[PDB]
Scaffold this active site. Structure first.
Site, short mmCIF file in Angstrom:
data_model
loop_
_atom_site.label_atom_id
_atom_site.label_comp_id
_atom_site.label_asym_id
_atom_site.label_seq_id
_atom_site.Cartn_x
_atom_site.Cartn_y
_atom_site.Cartn_z
N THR A 63 -6.15 17.55 50.36
CA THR A 63 -5.41 17.56 51.74
C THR A 63 -4.47 16.13 51.55
OG1 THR A 63 -5.37 17.69 54.00
CG2 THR A 63 -7.02 16.34 52.89
N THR A 64 -3.50 16.31 52.72
CA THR A 64 -2.85 15.16 52.65
C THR A 64 -2.63 14.78 54.25
OG1 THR A 64 -1.59 15.54 50.86
CG2 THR A 64 -0.64 13.98 51.87
N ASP A 101 -2.65 18.04 56.37
CA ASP A 101 -2.64 19.32 55.64
C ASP A 101 -4.00 20.36 55.73
OD1 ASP A 101 -3.46 21.04 53.18
OD2 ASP A 101 -1.21 20.71 53.02
N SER A 118 -3.49 20.26 45.59
CA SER A 118 -4.84 20.17 46.47
C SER A 118 -4.53 20.11 47.91
CB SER A 118 -5.65 18.72 45.99
OG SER A 118 -6.29 18.37 47.15
N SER A 119 -3.34 20.20 48.26
CA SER A 119 -2.56 20.34 49.49
C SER A 119 -1.77 21.57 49.82
CB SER A 119 -1.86 19.19 49.96
OG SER A 119 -2.70 18.01 50.16
#
EC number: 3.4.25.1
Lengths: 240, 201, 202, 250, 234, 237, 232, 216, 213
Positions: free
Chosen positions: C1-2, C17, C169-170
């Site tokens: 996530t971000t 995110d 990954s986001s």
């Protein structure tokens, strides 16, 4: 017997005579007064000169427990030193755990809780000392909490602990200390302490005076020497 | 590193080389590889010099306490068992020590062996060290329970000389100790060069 | 996530995110990565999901108890310091990065970052997560001091949209939350509302 | 704490121990327990005091417990102390069984219990367990064997012994009417009935007032059988018949 | 009971320690004399019955090859302290490759002394003070030395001291017959004659234990033949 | 009564009888007068002996090269606190590589002695310490009473019959500071001399001193090396 | 916290635990309660006499369950009852965790007795000032146990603790049958409760729990007053 | 600390007459990523002692917190004394050695500057607990870039003026910025002298790239 | 991975004369390929009759030096006297073995005078094996110094050479020459030398420049 032997038992009525004797032990000691004003909190404590061979500033009843919190004590001075160590330990823990200097309200609440916690078990005895803590903050102002040997902490416009505490309170009532100026209040503290001191009872005496407030940049300090002599002169004149 | 010891009719003989090496480098050529636990008790150092010295000294302290407490000289077997337990309680901890302790007690001459592995073995002849494998040959082929004192001395000296000569981790000088009823006697401390010249001529 | 946080004049805007992946498979495609520690303090969590959850819950515990003891609402710096201590004491096995932002009466809108390791420092704009690497240029080229609430919200949404569409990954949706004296107000940008940028089709 | 301590784990000026003396005195007025040895078994007679009609009395036995596979116990005194003592005895007996893969010898178990009781008297500052224990069992080394222990931590091996009220009278009856080496199970049972009738003469022998247990060795197996209420009635009838016969012959 | 183990007196001292000092005078008589040629220790055995073996009745103990000790009081309690002193001396030797000094031994014995209580330290500790007065005679780098260890922990270095049942009076007489330039033979003769005079019963080789420490020789305990040889002249 | 058999009890007058007993024992201890100058601080104690035969046990303990103490009371407790203080001093020298200042040492021992005043079944260390030290802020003299309360003092006298020495110190405290080392030690010796009655004499064989100066490490002097200080001394007043 | 290591309960010269007798006296001085057995279940009843109606008698509960098949009531001190029932709940939960089967009532009572004995023989503590009436159902059988502050226990078909407890016991003996139903048990329990209520029982003042093969369950005031009406 | 997660680069320091000067960039690098570029890697112990730190930044924050707390305790004592820079150096040494000895070290290298009693002190400690004092000190890549130049110029001039030291430190920071990947064009410098401690905010260095056109 | 040990370099040498001891060491502190400072003597004087040369990992060197100082102080207070050379050697050996499972990576040389006015040099190891020898060199260049000391001081492997006991001037000249030689071939030593002369007159410290490289 049985109702005054330990702090873990009530009197047949539900009293704590050990704590009452602690109150006696803090009353019979020398006087110590603390006056908070709108721009500062001052402490004037009375030092008994057992002999002139002592140093001025020896056995201080004024401790500096935090970067901005003072502590004026009365009662057993060793006990007062131990309590000052506990207070500065608590301040260090709060600073480490929260990144900033502890507020005086919570400091006093925690210290009073500790004092009361050592008034519950027969394995300990209640503290023979009462103490007033004064601090300053930019957002809080000047704060002053007095704490009993029982473990009760209250905010005081001005408090006195010792023999002539009530006389000091009553004569200083004429002062509207809640919106006064710390510099002149120092001189008025010198006055009140000189009048409430009994020269006949204690021929030899000394004064330890200090303040903390906005003029201190919010860090606890002792009175500068020059202000000390000037306040001493004012007190001498007020003795009349 | 080379120590040998053997009992016989007239007591016990212990011999040791005086070379201690820190790897492929001779650290010292004057190491007292024989430790005097008591005026009546002897140990050796083989392997970890510091570990051996420390454990021998601690055994000396313990046996002095035991002698003071029980008004008797400590049995060689009892000392061996105490040291074996003391080292074994720290087995598999990197300790590398091995030594034979000999003496005279209520049961005559007595020689025991202990190591960092906790192996406590009695016996008549022993030798531990880099060159002990060599010293075995000479000691076993010349050993006799009825050897005279001089024969025991020169047998031990010859065995140490051969071990130091063939091996490279052993050398310097031979220290010789004779343990009899009263205690130990430093028989000699002879340089290996002098030993070689004497044996050649 | 971000996770991305920016302070404005009198408050903060935070965003996260909604993707959490146990490798190539998304564990939760709508995950929440901004947790309210207090009514005016939020923590943007990234890294180990279990570590982030445990740290956030323990901090909520201890800070709520501390605020009750003081009888006063806490401070952003105080919360950030407590996160810093918690992360530093457990940096060996707690592996997480937390952005601590919000408003207090005494200091105003403030943001701090405690990445993996347990260190605290205040930043005007704070970025974290696996997708955090791809947007340093965009934030440096777009962010100017003196922004307002709405333009901070828009800038954070744009930066997080870029990060999520450039980072595997986001992804998913973006949760935004503005905190100020007025209160906390939170929205979700999903699908069309997310700012989609030009694609170099050839 | 100096004034307010009870200091029950110290000596006495005259050398006795008041706590164990009081424990024994309480046991004396506590219930009646009797153990006897026969050539083919060992018998226990326990007397229950609280016999209200409100009892559910569903339990197999009240003051008689099974320490392990081959040993039984009769308790005298505080039943709450008795329960914790009994399950501790079971625990340590099974511990010995685990450690040696062999039934724990009765002497072993009694010595262990007396050790722990003595230490509990020795220190700890607590009031001692005011319960007397009477253990019966069978073992490889001595077979049928029974011991009486005391709250002071002292134990003894007996062919037969009783604890409770009229203990001296009961032991006199045993010394008078016990045939050493020639006591069969039937004659042992009759002597036990005699003792139960006499050592507690107040509230004369009743079926529900006491409980009867037997321990025998059949086919290399220790069998502990609690005699049922019909059995206790049979014992009462046999005792009445034999007493009537003896009086008529007198 | 009622009174604790850490309770003083109205005049400001431990009556428990006063009781310990009383038990000291209840103890057996011992004498120690330090000279320039060594130090001598002696004690009366107080044989109860002839059936008791004189061998097991020994109040003089070796702490090291250069240190002997005379104990008076709770002889059962003194052996634990003696073991501690010996193990401490051997630890000092193990650490510094030298014999522990007698003064340091006495200081460590004092450290062990007066360390007791109800709830003040680990439960596996002492409850009562040691009730034994000690005389540490020895030889070290400071020549012959003699130390009176008081159960109070007030260790003293004294040239000559008599303790036990007949401590006082006998100590004054020993001082009067004692000089600053006496030989070891003179010291042993004087100690023996004072002990014989203060004996509550007719003494012989089976009523006294004698030991000495010399600058050259180690700690040596006088056997029966030498005891008779030195007592026949007195 | 019951207010004197324990430490955690509160007397109706507001006092601790165990503390009173400890402060009586410190006075019952032997005579020790300590004082200081502008640069140096010296303790002078008279070593009591159980008899004429005893060698007048030392009362002055070497706690550090710049700090020394003298005891009055329970010898075992005094030795324990001396070990504790010297452990602190070596800890400071090991950690900060500086001599631990006298004021902080005295505050630390006061904090240590405060705990027994609260702990159940725990007795105060019935010994008073006269601490003479030198550090960056010049010489310092402290008196730690067994009451766990310490007093900074220019010149203190402890032990029996100390009133005459106290009067001497009060009379000459104005001139203690500016006199040099031999005059300072002579003043302390005369105070100790006036402590004792006329018929007794301030013999060299039972008096010891411990002195620390600006350049002088804390050193103790005994019978033979206090003889030069015992030169030209006036007879007993 | 230090903790006294000397047992406050000590053997008197006669051996009687007079402290435990005082605990039983406190039990008797506390509120009364009754328990009764039927051929197919157990019924526990007790009265909750508060002060004037300012107390919300509905808010607090006196009958408490331990499991779905075990309930209990007490006579004595509520502060002790709370901690005792909490510990009994913990013990039952631990047994269920270990053996994946419901706690037998006999074993639960044995554990409670062991706890009480540990309190009575341990130092620094006070004996519990309650008597527990425990109802339980297991293996298709009812069980009712008396547990005393002395730490012992019994299996009692009927019992009455508190004020007038001996007379309650005699009344239960007179009005007790061996093969009665649960309805008869409820009739008898309410009859005893009204005979020893002293002040005109109400549905709020009476709280009852029933334990049978269906489990343990506390009767709400509706069916409570229904049974009081049916019983008169 | 097992691994340093964010790391600040070298710290430089020299001593002049009546004082010392220290410098360090304001960048905290997350490996090869420069996440933080305005943080302070220099902590003020008091008005006479100051510290510069390299290595991990979280450990530096913890060390600064502990040192500040203990200086606060010393000030609260109010005995009229002050911890000398020597004492600060020794305490940092001992803390580092204990921290390693517990196999959980502090990934930081510290330069301890100070000026007390007319003496300019410049101490060096590292993660592994080595301690020494030198007229010139440099951590990390500074020890290879500036420390040679520092040592050369100090051997040429045993004592150099305050402005000479400032110019030398500026040149050395210039060299580190040129030849160190973990540096930053803006750096924080500070001076400890008799007046006290002064941190001259953020400062930049002049860069010459004329050689960039020499490629052919 | 973290490495608790690192070799800082340094060379210690000592020669025990019939009435004096000499202990010399360079003042070069090293780390990998960089030299920190030109002044850090490895010699530390405990008393007026004993000096210690400690080489190797500098952190362990400093901590062990302070531990020896603290134990010296404790023994001094306990026994009211200073420590002998043999007592210091045994104490340091016990300290070394106290860290058997976390060895001190330091080489130690105890150079002092005993009660008989005789030099005594004690060599050690990282674990704590010790002995007394007339002369010993340890540290970086122990291998480059031992043969020359053996041939010169010990007169080892020499024919038609009588054994004159070494004087102070001979020992000083020899140690200066041997470090002159060592600084050339060894990279861990040079640029400076501090020499401590332990004699009944006291401890004399002499500094001599070496190969500045």
């Amino acid at each position: 017997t049985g109702y005054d032997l330990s702090a873990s038992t009530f009197s047949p009525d539900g009293r704590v005579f050990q704590v009452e004797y602690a109150m006696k032990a803090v009353e019979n000691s020398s006087t110590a007064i603390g006056i908070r004003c709108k721009d500062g909190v001052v402490f004037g404590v009375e030092k008994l000169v057992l002999s002139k061979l002592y140093e001025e500033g020896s056995n201080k009843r004024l401790f500096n427990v935090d970067r901005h919190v003072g502590m004026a004590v009365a009662g057993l001075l060793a006990d007062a030193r131990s309590l000052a160590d506990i207070a500065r330990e608590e301040a260090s823990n709060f600073r480490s755990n929260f990144g900033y200097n502890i507020p005086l309200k919570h400091l006093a609440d925690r210290v009073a809780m500790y004092v009361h916690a050592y008034t519950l078990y027969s394995a300990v005895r209640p503290f023979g000392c009462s103490f007033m803590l004064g601090s300053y903050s930019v957002n809080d102002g000047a704060q002053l909490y007095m704490i009993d040997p029982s473990g009760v902490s209250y905010g005081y416009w001005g408090c006195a602990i010792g023999k002539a505490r009530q006389a000091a309170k009553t004569e200083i009532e004429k002062l509207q200390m809640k919106e006064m100026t710390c510099r002149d209040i120092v001189k008025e503290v010198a006055k009140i302490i000189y009048i409430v001191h009994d020269e006949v009872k204690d021929k030899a005496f000394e004064l330890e005076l200090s303040w903390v407030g906005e003029l201190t940049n919010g860090r606890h300090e002792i009175v500068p020497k020059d202000i000390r002599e000037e306040a001493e002169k004012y007190a001498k004149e007020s003795l009349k | 590193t080379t120590t040998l010891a053997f009992k016989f009719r007239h007591g016990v003989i212990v011999a040791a080389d005086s070379r201690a090496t820190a790897g492929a480098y001779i650290a010292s050529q004057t190491v007292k590889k024989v430790i005097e636990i008591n005026p009546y008790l002897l140990g050796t150092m083989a392997g970890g010099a510091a570990d051996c010295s420390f454990w021998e000294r601690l055994l000396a302290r313990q046996c002095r306490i035991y002698e003071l407490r029980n008004k008797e000289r400590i049995s060689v077997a009892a000392a061996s068992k105490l040291l074996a337990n003391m080292v074994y309680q720290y087995k598999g901890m990197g300790l590398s020590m091995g030594t034979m302790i000999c003496g005279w007690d209520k049961r005559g001459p007595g020689l025991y062996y202990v190591d960092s592995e906790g192996n406590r073995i009695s016996g008549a002849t022993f030798s531990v060290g880099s060159g002990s494998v060599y010293a075995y040959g000479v000691m076993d082929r010349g050993y006799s329970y009825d050897l005279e004192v001089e024969q025991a001395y020169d047998l031990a000296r010859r065995a140490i000389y051969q071990a130091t000569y063939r091996d490279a981790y052993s050398g310097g000088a031979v220290n010789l100790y004779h343990v009899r009823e009263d205690g130990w006697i430093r028989v000699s401390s002879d340089n290996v060069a002098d030993l070689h010249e004497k044996y050649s001529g | 996530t971000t996770i991305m946080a920016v302070q404005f004049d009198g408050g903060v805007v935070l965003g996260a995110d909604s993707r959490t992946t146990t490798g190539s498979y998304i564990a939760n495609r709508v995950t929440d990565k901004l947790t309210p520690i207090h009514d005016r303090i939020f923590c943007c969590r990234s890294g180990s999901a279990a570590d982030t959850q445990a740290v956030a819950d323990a901090v909520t515990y201890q800070l709520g108890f501390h605020s009750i003891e003081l009888n006063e609402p806490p401070l952003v710096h105080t919360a950030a310091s407590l996160f810093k201590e918690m992360c530093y004491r457990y940096r060996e096995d707690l592996m997480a990065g937390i952005i601590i932002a919000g408003w207090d009466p005494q200091e105003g809108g403030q943001v701090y970052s405690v990445p993996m390791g347990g260190m605290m420092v205040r930043q005007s704009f704070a970025i974290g997560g696996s997708g955090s690497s791809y947007i340093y240029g965009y934030v440096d080229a777009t962010y100017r001091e003196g922004m307002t609430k709405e333009e901070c919200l828009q800038f954070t949404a744009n930066a997080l949209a870029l990060a999520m569409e450039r980072d595997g990954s986001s992804g998913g949706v973006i949760r935004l939350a503005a905190i100020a004296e007025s209160g906390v107000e939170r929205q979700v940008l999903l699908g069309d509302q997310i700012p989609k940028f030009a694609v170099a089709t050839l | 704490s100096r004034r307010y301590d009870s200091r029950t784990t110290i000596f006495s000026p005259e050398g006795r121990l008041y706590q164990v003396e009081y424990a024994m005195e309480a046991i004396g007025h506590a219930g009646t327990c009797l153990g006897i040895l026969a050539n083919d078994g060992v018998l226990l007679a326990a007397e229950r005091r609280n016999i209200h009609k409100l009892l559910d009395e569903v339990f197999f036995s009240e003051k008689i417990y099974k320490l392990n596979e081959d040993m039984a116990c009769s308790v005298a005194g505080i039943t709450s102390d008795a329960n914790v003592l009994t399950n501790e005895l079971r625990l340590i007996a099974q511990r010995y069984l685990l450690q040696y893969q062999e039934p724990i010898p009765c002497e072993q178990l009694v010595t262990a219990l007396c050790d722990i009781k003595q230490a509990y008297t020795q220190f700890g500052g607590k009031r001692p367990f005011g319960v007397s224990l009477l253990y019966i069992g069978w073992d490889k080394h001595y077979g049928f064997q029974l011991y009486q222990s005391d709250p002071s931590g002292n134990y003894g091996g007996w062919k037969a012994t009783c604890i409770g009220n009229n203990s001296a009278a009961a032991v006199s009856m045993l010394k008078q009417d016990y045939k050493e080496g020639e006591m069969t199970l039937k004659s042992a049972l009759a002597l036990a009935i005699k003792v139960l009738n006499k050592t507690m003469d107040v509230s004369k022998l009743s079926a529900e007032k006491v409980e009867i247990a037997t321990l025998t060795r059949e086919n290399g197996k220790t069998v502990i059988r609690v005699l049922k209420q019909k059995e206790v009635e049979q014992l009462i009838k046999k005792h009445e018949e034999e007493e009537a016969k003896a009086e008529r012959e007198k | 009971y009622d009174r604790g183990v850490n309770t003083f007196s109205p005049e400001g001292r431990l009556f428990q320690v006063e009781y310990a000092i009383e038990a000291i005078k209840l103890g057996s008589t011992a004498i120690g004399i330090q000279t320039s040629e060594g130090v001598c220790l002696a004690v009366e055995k107080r044989i109860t019955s002839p059936l008791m073996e004189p061998s097991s009745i020994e109040k003089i103990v070796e702490i090291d090859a250069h240190i002997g000790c005379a104990m008076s009081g709770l002889i059962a309690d003194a052996k634990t302290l003696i073991d501690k002193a010996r193990v401490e001396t051997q630890n000092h030797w193990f650490t510094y490759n030298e014999t522990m000094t007698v003064e340091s031994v006495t200081q460590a014995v004092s450290n062990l002394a007066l360390q007791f209580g109800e709830e003040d330290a680990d439960p596996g500790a002492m409850s009562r003070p040691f009730g034994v007065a000690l005389l540490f005679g020895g030889v070290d780098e400071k020549g012959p030395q003699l130390f009176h260890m008081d159960p109070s922990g007030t260790f003293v270095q004294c040239d000559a001291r008599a303790i036990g049942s007949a401590s006082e009076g006998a100590q004054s007489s020993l001082q009067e017959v004692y000089h600053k330039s006496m030989t070891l033979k003179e010291a042993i003769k004087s100690s023996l004659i004072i002990l014989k005079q203060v004996m509550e019963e007719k003494l012989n080789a089976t009523n006294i234990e004698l030991a000495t420490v010399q600058p050259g020789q180690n700690f040596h305990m006088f056997t029966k033949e030498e005891l008779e040889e030195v007592i026949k002249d007195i | 009564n019951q207010y004197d058999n324990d430490v955690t009890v509160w007397s109706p007058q507001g006092r601790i009888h165990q503390i009173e007993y400890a402060m009586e024992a410190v006075k019952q201890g032997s005579a020790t007068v300590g004082l200081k100058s502008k640069t140096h601080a010296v303790l002078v104690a008279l070593k009591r002996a159980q008899s004429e035969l005893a060698a007048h046990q030392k009362k002055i303990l070497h706690v550090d090269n710049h700090i020394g103490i003298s005891i009055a009371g329970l010898t075992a407790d005094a030795r324990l606190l001396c070990n504790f203080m010297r452990q602190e001093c070596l800890d400071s020298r090991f950690v900060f590589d500086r001599p631990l200042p006298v004021s902080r040492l005295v505050s630390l021992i006061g904090s240590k002695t405060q705990i027994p005043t609260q702990r159940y079944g725990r007795r105060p260390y019935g010994v008073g310490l006269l601490i003479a030290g030198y550090d960056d802020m010049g010489p310092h003299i402290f008196q730690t009473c067994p009451s766990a309360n310490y007093f900074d003092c220019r010149a203190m006298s402890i032990g029996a019959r100390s009133q005459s020495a106290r009067t001497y110190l009060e009379r000459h405290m104005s001139e203690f500071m500016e006199c040099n080392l031999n005059e300072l030690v002579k003043h302390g010796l005369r105070a100790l001399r006036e402590t004792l009655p006329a018929e007794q004499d301030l013999t060299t064989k039972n008096v010891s001193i411990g002195i620390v100066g600006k350049d002088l490490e804390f050193t103790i002097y005994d019978d033979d090396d206090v003889s030069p200080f015992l030169e030209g001394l006036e007879e007993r007043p | 916290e230090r903790g006294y290591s000397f047992s406050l309960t000590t053997f008197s010269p006669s051996g009687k635990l007079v402290q435990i007798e005082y605990a039983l006296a406190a039990v008797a001085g506390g509120a009364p309660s009754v328990g009764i057995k039927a051929a197919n279940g157990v019924v526990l009843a007790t009265e909750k006499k508060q002060k004037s109606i300012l107390y919300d008698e509905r808010s607090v509960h006196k009958v408490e369950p331990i499991t779905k098949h075990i309930g209990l009531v007490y006579s004595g001190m509520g502060p002790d009852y709370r901690v005792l029932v909490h510990r009994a709940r913990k013990l039952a939960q631990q047994y269920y965790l270990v053996y994946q089967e419901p706690i037998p009532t006999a074993q639960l009572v044995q554990r409670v007795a062991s706890v009480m004995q540990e309190y009575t023989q341990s130092g620094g503590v006070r004996p519990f000032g309650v008597s527990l009436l425990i109802c339980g159902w297991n293996e298709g059988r009812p069980y009712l146990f008396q547990s005393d502050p002395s730490g012992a226990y019994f299996a009692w078909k009927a019992t009455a603790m508190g004020k007038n407890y001996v007379n309650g016991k005699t009344f239960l003996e007179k009005r007790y049958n061996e093969d009665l139903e649960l309805e008869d048990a409820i009739h008898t329990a309410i009859l005893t409760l009204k005979e020893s209520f002293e002040g005109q029982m109400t549905e709020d003042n009476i709280e009852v729990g029933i334990c049978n093969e269906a489990g343990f369950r506390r009767l709400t005031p509706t069916e409570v007053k229904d049974y009081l009406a049916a019983i008169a | 600390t097992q691994n340093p997660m964010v790391t600040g680069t070298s710290v430089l320091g020299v001593k002049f007459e009546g004082g010392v000067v220290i410098a360090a960039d304001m960048l905290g690098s997350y490996g090869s990523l420069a996440r933080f570029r305005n943080i302070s890697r220099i902590m003020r112990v008091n008005n006479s002692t100051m510290l510069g730190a390299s290595g991990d930044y979280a450990d530096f924050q913890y060390l600064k917190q502990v040192l500040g707390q203990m200086v606060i305790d010393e000030e609260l004592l109010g005995d009229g004394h002050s911890y000398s820079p020597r004492a600060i150096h020794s305490w940092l040494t001992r803390a580092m050695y204990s921290r390693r000895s517990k196999m959980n070290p502090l990934w930081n290298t510290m330069v301890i500057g100070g000026y007390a009693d007319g003496e300019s002190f410049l101490g060096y400690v590292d993660m592994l607990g080595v301690a020494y004092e030198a007229p010139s000190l440099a951590t990390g890549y500074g020890a290879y870039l500036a420390q040679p130049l520092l040592r050369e110029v100090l051997e040429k001039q045993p004592v150099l003026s305050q402005t000479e030291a400032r110019d030398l430190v500026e040149r050395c920071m210039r060299v580190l910025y040129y030849r160190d990947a973990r540096s930053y064009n803006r750096f924080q410098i500070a001076t400890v002298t008799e007046k006290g401690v002064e941190i001259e905010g953020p400062l930049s260095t002049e860069t010459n790239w004329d050689i960039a056109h020499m490629i052919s | 991975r973290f490495s608790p040990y690192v070799f800082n370099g340094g060379t210690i040498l000592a020669i025990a004369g019939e009435d004096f001891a000499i202990v010399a060491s360079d003042t070069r502190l090293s780390e990998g390929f960089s030299i920190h400072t030109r002044d850090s003597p490895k010699c530390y004087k405990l008393t007026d009759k004993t000096v210690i040369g400690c080489s190797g990992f500098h952190g362990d060197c400093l901590t062990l030096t302070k531990i020896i100082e603290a134990r010296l102080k404790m023994y001094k207070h306990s026994n009211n006297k200073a420590m002998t050379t043999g007592a210091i050697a045994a104490m340091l050996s016990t300290i070394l073995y106290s860290r058997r499972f976390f060895p001190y990576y330091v080489y130690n040389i105890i150079g002092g005078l005993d009660e008989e006015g005789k030099g005594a040099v004690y060599s050690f190891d990282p674990v704590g094996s010790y002995q007394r020898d007339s002369f010993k060199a340890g540290g970086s260049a122990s291998a480059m110094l031992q043969p020359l000391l053996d041939n010169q001081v010990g007169f080892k492997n020499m024919q038609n050479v009588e054994h004159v006991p070494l004087s102070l001037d001979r020992a000083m000249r020899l140690v200066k020459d041997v470090f002159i030689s060592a600084a050339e071939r060894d990279v861990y030593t040079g640029d400076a030398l501090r020499i401590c002369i332990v004699t009944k007159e006291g401890i004399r410290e002499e500094t001599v420049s070496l190969r500045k490289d």
